[PDB]
Scaffold this active site. Sequence first.
Site, short mmCIF file in Angstrom:
data_model
loop_
_atom_site.label_atom_id
_atom_site.label_comp_id
_atom_site.label_asym_id
_atom_site.label_seq_id
_atom_site.Cartn_x
_atom_site.Cartn_y
_atom_site.Cartn_z
N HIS A 1 -46.74 -13.89 -31.61
CA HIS A 1 -46.37 -13.02 -30.49
C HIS A 1 -47.45 -12.00 -30.13
CE1 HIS A 1 -45.33 -10.76 -34.06
NE2 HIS A 1 -45.43 -9.65 -33.34
N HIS B 1 -42.14 -12.27 -41.24
CA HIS B 1 -40.69 -12.09 -41.38
C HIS B 1 -39.93 -13.34 -40.96
CE1 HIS B 1 -41.23 -8.01 -42.47
NE2 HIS B 1 -40.99 -7.39 -41.29
N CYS C 1 -49.25 -6.45 -29.65
CA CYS C 1 -48.22 -6.00 -30.58
C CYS C 1 -48.68 -4.81 -31.39
CB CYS C 1 -47.68 -7.09 -31.50
SG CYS C 1 -46.34 -6.31 -32.49
N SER D 1 -44.45 -9.25 -38.57
CA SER D 1 -43.20 -9.79 -38.01
C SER D 1 -43.23 -11.32 -37.97
CB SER D 1 -42.91 -9.26 -36.63
OG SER D 1 -42.85 -7.85 -36.66
N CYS E 1 -49.22 -10.81 -37.34
CA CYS E 1 -48.41 -9.59 -37.50
C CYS E 1 -47.40 -9.82 -38.63
CB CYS E 1 -47.68 -9.25 -36.19
SG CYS E 1 -46.50 -7.89 -36.26
N1 LIG Z 1 -40.91 -2.03 -33.75
C1 LIG Z 1 -41.80 -2.95 -33.33
O1 LIG Z 1 -41.91 -3.25 -32.12
C2 LIG Z 1 -42.66 -3.60 -34.31
C3 LIG Z 1 -43.93 -4.15 -33.96
C4 LIG Z 1 -44.81 -4.58 -34.90
C5 LIG Z 1 -44.43 -4.57 -36.23
N2 LIG Z 1 -43.18 -4.19 -36.59
C6 LIG Z 1 -42.81 -4.07 -37.99
O2 LIG Z 1 -43.55 -3.00 -38.57
C7 LIG Z 1 -43.72 -3.26 -39.99
C8 LIG Z 1 -45.18 -3.10 -40.34
O3 LIG Z 1 -45.92 -4.20 -39.77
P1 LIG Z 1 -47.45 -4.39 -40.20
O4 LIG Z 1 -48.18 -3.13 -40.16
O5 LIG Z 1 -47.92 -5.60 -39.47
O6 LIG Z 1 -47.18 -4.79 -41.79
P2 LIG Z 1 -48.03 -4.74 -43.08
O7 LIG Z 1 -49.46 -4.96 -42.82
O8 LIG Z 1 -47.29 -5.60 -44.07
O9 LIG Z 1 -47.96 -3.22 -43.55
C9 LIG Z 1 -46.84 -2.71 -44.30
C10 LIG Z 1 -47.40 -1.73 -45.35
O10 LIG Z 1 -46.26 -1.21 -46.03
C11 LIG Z 1 -46.67 -0.98 -47.37
N3 LIG Z 1 -45.49 -0.88 -48.20
C12 LIG Z 1 -44.67 -1.87 -48.65
N4 LIG Z 1 -43.65 -1.34 -49.35
C13 LIG Z 1 -43.82 0.00 -49.38
C14 LIG Z 1 -43.11 1.13 -49.98
N5 LIG Z 1 -42.02 0.99 -50.68
N6 LIG Z 1 -43.60 2.32 -49.69
C15 LIG Z 1 -44.72 2.53 -48.96
N7 LIG Z 1 -45.46 1.54 -48.44
C16 LIG Z 1 -44.97 0.30 -48.65
C17 LIG Z 1 -47.54 -2.18 -47.69
O11 LIG Z 1 -48.32 -2.01 -48.87
C18 LIG Z 1 -48.31 -2.38 -46.39
O12 LIG Z 1 -49.60 -1.81 -46.40
C19 LIG Z 1 -43.11 -4.64 -40.25
O13 LIG Z 1 -41.75 -4.55 -40.67
C20 LIG Z 1 -43.10 -5.27 -38.87
O14 LIG Z 1 -42.16 -6.32 -38.74
C21 LIG Z 1 -42.34 -3.63 -35.67
ZN LIG Z 2 -45.58 -7.75 -34.08
#
Ligand SMILES: NC(=O)c1ccc[n+]([C@@H]2O[C@H](COP(=O)([O-])OP(=O)([O-])OC[C@H]3O[C@@H](n4cnc5c(N)[nH+]cnc54)[C@H](O)[C@@H]3O)[C@@H](O)[C@H]2O)c1
Ligand SMILES: [Zn+2]
Lengths: 374, 374
Positions: A67, A51, A174, A48, A46
């Site tokens: 996770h 991160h 997740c 995260s 993920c």
């Molecule tokens: N709230 C929760 O419980 C929870 C759970 C899981 C993930 N997260 C978060 O959710 C986010 C997405 O996770 P993911 O899908 O695994 O990540 P990921 O696969 O990195 O997807 C993020 C997407 O954002 C795109 N991106 C980056 N910058 C920009 C921009 N300026 N404008 C538009 N698109 C852009 C990027 O190209 C990518 O496809 C991350 O910050 C995670 O930490 C939160």
């Molecule tokens: Zn996650």
Amino acid sequence: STAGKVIKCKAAVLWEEKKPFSIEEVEVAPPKAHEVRIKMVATGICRSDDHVVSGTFVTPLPVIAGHEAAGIVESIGEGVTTVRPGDKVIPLFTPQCGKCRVCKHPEGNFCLKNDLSMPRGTMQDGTSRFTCRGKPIHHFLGTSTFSQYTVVDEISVAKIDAASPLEKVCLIGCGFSTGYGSAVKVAKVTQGSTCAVFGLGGVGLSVIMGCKAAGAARIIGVDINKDKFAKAKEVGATECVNPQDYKKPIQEVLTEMSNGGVDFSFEVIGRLDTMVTALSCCQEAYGVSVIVGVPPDSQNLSMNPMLLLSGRTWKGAIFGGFKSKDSVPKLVADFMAKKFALDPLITHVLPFEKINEGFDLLRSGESIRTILTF
Amino acid sequence: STAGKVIKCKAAVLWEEKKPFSIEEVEVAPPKAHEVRIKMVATGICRSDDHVVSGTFVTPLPVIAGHEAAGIVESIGEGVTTVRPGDKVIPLFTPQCGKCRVCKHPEGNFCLKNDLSMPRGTMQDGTSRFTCRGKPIHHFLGTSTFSQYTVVDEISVAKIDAASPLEKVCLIGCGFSTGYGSAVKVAKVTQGSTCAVFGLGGVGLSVIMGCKAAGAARIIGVDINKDKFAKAKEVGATECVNPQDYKKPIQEVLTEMSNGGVDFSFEVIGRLDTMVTALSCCQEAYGVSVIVGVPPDSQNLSMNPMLLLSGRTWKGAIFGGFKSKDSVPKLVADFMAKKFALDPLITHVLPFEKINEGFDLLRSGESIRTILTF
Ligand SMILES: NC(=O)c1ccc[n+]([C@@H]2O[C@H](COP(=O)([O-])OP(=O)([O-])OC[C@H]3O[C@@H](n4cnc5c(N)[nH+]cnc54)[C@H](O)[C@@H]3O)[C@@H](O)[C@H]2O)c1
Ligand SMILES: [Zn+2]
Ligand SMILES: NC(=O)c1ccc[n+]([C@@H]2O[C@H](COP(=O)([O-])OP(=O)([O-])OC[C@H]3O[C@@H](n4cnc5c(N)[nH+]cnc54)[C@H](O)[C@@H]3O)[C@@H](O)[C@H]2O)c1
Ligand SMILES: [Zn+2]
Ligand SMILES: [Zn+2]
Ligand SMILES: [Zn+2]
């Protein structure tokens, strides 16, 4: 029998930020009262977890991250009642103690026993079950799934269907549940609505799945990586837009496309600027915007509160708003009954030993979810 | 007869910011198609009118302000079907055109015909009905109630009960409805909940009334002016706290008092810092915070989005979320049926000629609502 004994196994230890994981032997203590030791079967990568590496999400180091996972119970500590050895399980990075004011609330899910708000990197009792090179190693969100064996508190594990394919259902721990619930439970997307989804990774794709399941008429995917658009359309996006293609700010573009603003928007990236853009692009009187992405540690956004005074609703959630221990088994049962698909999220499979290659795939933009097999 | 003729009458003209109103003769044109000319009976002094004077709220000057009022129709333009000469009416500072996407939405009320977002200070047709010393004078929010006569668009007026006491029900034109609806409609306060209300002026007292009507168990009033506490308790506050009395920030105090955060909080002041405080003091997983206060022009707040990611909901609203033309007559009927009280909001009743003394009472902290009588 390994019950009651220290297990030596391989784990992916993060000694330092911005460095590869080290695959090496750790010692995993047996479970204490109300703890569960799990033999991991599959874990997803993920963003995260990345991160933690990048310092976007601060948690004590050194650490065993991970996770999003599924495994089989190896042993249970004294007093455990909800799982038994041999059960298939999903660790819960958001616990469900069942006793705090949040667990008792009909709409809360961010249990007060979580280790996310102010991470300590321990078990509930403030100690660690992991040693490496003779040194204690931190846990991550009470799960630490980048290890052949982990120990979790009972409130951080759910028993799931014994016939579950663990290499798929780990995503219910997740990314799938977070995105899908953010649409169906947190936003409560309505039939015939227009949605905008910022970020088309595994979580954003799961948001799209939820918006389509809720009957949205239009689902506009937004990503700066146009390679993400094909899969977004496969899972329900009606249009995709790349902000880099436009002279105007994308909130103006989306407001124009939606004839005055969208019904529901979702920030699924983790940037302060896109959180404000996503709020602005929902209709000013009745729009709803949901923050899903994890922001950079300790940084504040700036916004004009007139965006809210006109009538917008702004909210966020962890884990799609799902009460974790109640919901995870039900989501697995629904997956088994074909109520949603997980394969669209899985783009790559690797053995656990190739974890660093799996993070390379995520960082290059090439993957959605890589599933690691132990 | 006055119908079809210019009326020369008395009004309170604001020629420039941060100066007294000038009470002098204006000319009021007759109503055009789909317009209504009203003889004013009573108008309240809302803090939002003072925001025009102070430059907190930007609208074109010179201007006839006033937006909380009641009066009697003097004449109607061609095509008016919803009011007749002699009807008691309340001008609607938020219109209800019935045709726009917001008016058609079940939960929207900020009609796209409003003059609040990007104020032009005119009638719907982009012209003014007011002259003073040969100069055109702007309208305010399509109402302009600080005048013996005003002209409003049909979508900006509601007919009310012929037996209505206008010196009381003018408060349904802004302060009462805004506060009450912010609690019962926007927040949807629940029975048994704990609420915090920041700002104990006319609007904040009306929020308390709504929280009590919704069955809240605890209603904590927050004001830096302890002289406001007695009336807040009379209308339902269970506790009052003055931030100046504490060494800790009041969000920490309120979180402690509520054993981990309130269910519902309301910002009813118009300060960026109290908007963030009010959000922070609601429970992090399931709390709701509503912005009611009008922020200072063009200023942004700063906040940590982790406040939302844990599960909080942040929203704002104009006019308590009420669809104005549908709701105002029903609120008057409910007042006539003794469903709520207005007298607790009224501290002063002055002739219109004393408008500047009424504003001085508000600015000194000495009044809740002054009603001006024509
Ligand atoms: N709230 C929760 O419980 C929870 C759970 C899981 C993930 N997260 C978060 O959710 C986010 C997405 O996770 P993911 O899908 O695994 O990540 P990921 O696969 O990195 O997807 C993020 C997407 O954002 C795109 N991106 C980056 N910058 C920009 C921009 N300026 N404008 C538009 N698109 C852009 C990027 O190209 C990518 O496809 C991350 O910050 C995670 O930490 C939160
Ligand atoms: Zn996650
Ligand atoms: N959203 C809407 O439709 C709407 C309608 C009506 C009024 N308003 C706004 O609502 C706000 C309240 O209006 P009102 O009740 O007429 O005003 P008011 O009578 O001036 O009441 C404001 C109260 O806030 C108190 N106060 C000032 N600073 C602080 C502080 N730092 N901490 C706690 N208390 C403080 C002050 O002592 C006073 O009792 C104003 O900003 C109005 O412009 C908005
Ligand atoms: Zn709990
Ligand atoms: Zn309208
Ligand atoms: Zn007002």
